[PDB]
Structure 1
Amino acid sequence: QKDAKSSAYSSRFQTPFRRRREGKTDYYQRKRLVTQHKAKYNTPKYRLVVRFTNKDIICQIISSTITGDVVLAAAYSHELPRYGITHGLTNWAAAYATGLLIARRTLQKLGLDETYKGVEEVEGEYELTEAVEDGPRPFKVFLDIGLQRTTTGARVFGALKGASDGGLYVPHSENRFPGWDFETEEIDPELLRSYIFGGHVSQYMEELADDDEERFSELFKGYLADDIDADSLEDIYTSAHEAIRADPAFKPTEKKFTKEQYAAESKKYRQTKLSKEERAARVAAKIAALAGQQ
């Protein structure tokens, strides 16, 4: 745009770290999650990474190494069909389930699963998972929100709630769970439980049903197709916890074709570049083209 960059501008320009350029990692936050007290030596600080894509919920227990971050365990809302949930796969309730799943999943693999049940009950009341006496302290993890905004009622703290209720020690506070009243400075646990089991989606389903068969029919095309009536959402989620606590272990997809087969096709849609000689030829040609005034 005649806003051209002088070769001097480019030459002195210092680039941000790669992941900064690409808008993914906040480094000020990362320094503070990751850095360990120097006299706890190689004790890993462990983050509960929670991200949302437009269609999936990612949940990862990650730690740090100069040579790269290291995942202990991972869970994804896309897993949830295995345990009964087939819709609203990025809603709060799934965030809760996914946080539960990751919790039971890692501390299964940690040995820690029987000692440290979690809550099992679930009325969504504020409580941290507190340590047994004369036994192992709970496995402790710190929420990594990434770049997400801390809003009071955010999905991300759903994953926190599931994972805390899962038996992980994840330090937190009530004031961002839905149901926190800023005037009251209290948390109505009624509301928070409702979210855990999807109440907010369920009530909407009913209102819409009664007030707009048509729009209800698009937004809930799926539920219609599966004969899922609305006031059975709670069962779906309640029964989903059962399932998840019953069997948190990771089963990987069944996998048509091998990493090799994938490789030989899957980006031999990849443009292959020229050798310094082909380039020369192109150069010499282009001139013969361009030479002769106009």
Structure 2
Amino acid sequence: KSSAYSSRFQTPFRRRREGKTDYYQRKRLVTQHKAKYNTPKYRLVVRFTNKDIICQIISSTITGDVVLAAAYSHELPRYGITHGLTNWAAAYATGLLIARRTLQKLGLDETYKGVEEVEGEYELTEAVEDGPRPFKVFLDIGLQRTTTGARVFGALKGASDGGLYVPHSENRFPGWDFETEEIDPELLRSYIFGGHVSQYMEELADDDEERFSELFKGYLADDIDADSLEDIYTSAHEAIRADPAFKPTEKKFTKEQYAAESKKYRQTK
């Protein structure tokens, strides 16, 4: 193009060129009642890549955001989940994980236990009587389009069942009836564990057997049938109560051997 176009062009912000943010929404989340002067405004950031889930507790400062705690789907094998890592179930598990991580990184894991026996009900985390208040965070789904049944409201549910008071309304959880404006909790509890995957597996296991294995080639490794997912995911839910703390990997190198190779691939000037 010509020069008059470029010399009077305006570059949008870097992350709006990259497409990874919405400032019209960030201005609504980050900003706070000024009489609440320097207090933070905590967001449950949640993102669904092609094969991994990210969850984060994010505060906002001037020179970038600040991460209190975060969770990724690729450590759930520490508790027992090995396949179906981008799932409504894995989202609920990771929400419970991040919640139970933060609620002892702050020191409230005893007062607010959340719900220990899920039944798929819309229940908001109340405050204790004459004690600390729940951890009040909010939620921002990226550029995602909210639709009922989404993978992300599973994480919302796991969070609120962990205890950290994410306000929400049931009309985007699945099993909500547009007609009568009510919810079916049993369908929701089915989707918590394997209800949209186990049913499909035990459908194809007598409809089309070869294709069932072509897709679920991994669920036949340790001999997981399409009924053990309940006792698997609840054992995950309980181990997360047992030991939600983050314990990082062990590195084969020390951040200089890592850099030495890329320093002879990066194609300097």
TMscore range, shorter length: over 0.9
1:156-180 Cα distance to aligned partner (Å, 9 max, x none): 1110000010111100010000110
SS at 1:39 equivalent: coil
Deviation at 1:268, TM superposition (A): 2.2
What's the TM-score once normalised by structure 2's chain length?
Answer: 0.98
Q: Distance in 2 between matches of 1:66 and 1:268?
A: 35
Aligned partners of 1:99 and 1:162 also within 8 Å: yes
Q: Structure 2: how far apart are the matches of 1:267 and 1:178?
A: 49
Cα deviation, residue 266, structure 1: 2.6
What is the aligned partner in structure 2 of residue 223 from structure 1?
219
Deviations 1:179-228 (A, max 9, x none): 10100200100011111112111100000111111110111100112201
Pick one of 103, 109, 114 that aligns with 1:107.
103
- Once the two structures are TM-superposed, the CA of residue 267 in structure 1 deviates from its matched residue by 4.1
Q: TM-score, normalised by structure 1?
A: 0.90
Q: Distance in 1 between matches of 2:191 and 2:40?
A: 33
Are the aligned partners of 1:46 and 1:140 in contact in 2 as well (CA < 8 Å)?
A: yes
Specify the SS of the correspondent of 1:42: coil
RMSD: 2.1
SS at match of 1:61: strand
Partner residue, 2:70:
74
Q: What is the CA distance between 1:260 and its match in structure 2? A: 1.1
Q: Deviations over 1:222-242 (max 9, x none)?
A: 011220111001111000000
Q: How far does the alpha carbon of each residue in 1:108-145 deviate from its partner, in whole angstroms, 9 at most, with x for none?
A: 10001111000011001000111001100000110111
Larger radius of gyration: 1
SS at match of 1:192: helix
Shift of residue 146, structure 1, vs aligned partner: 0.9
Rounded to whole Å, the distance in 2 between the matches of 1:200 and 1:166 is 23
Which residue is equivalent to 2:164? 168
What per-residue deviation string (whole Å, max 9, x for no partner) do you get for residues 65-118 of structure 1?
A: 100000000011111000110000001100000001000001110001111000
Q: Which runs of 5+ in 1 are unaligned?
A: 273-293
SS at match of 2:196: helix
SS in 2 for 1:58: strand
Percent sequence identity over aligned pairs: 100
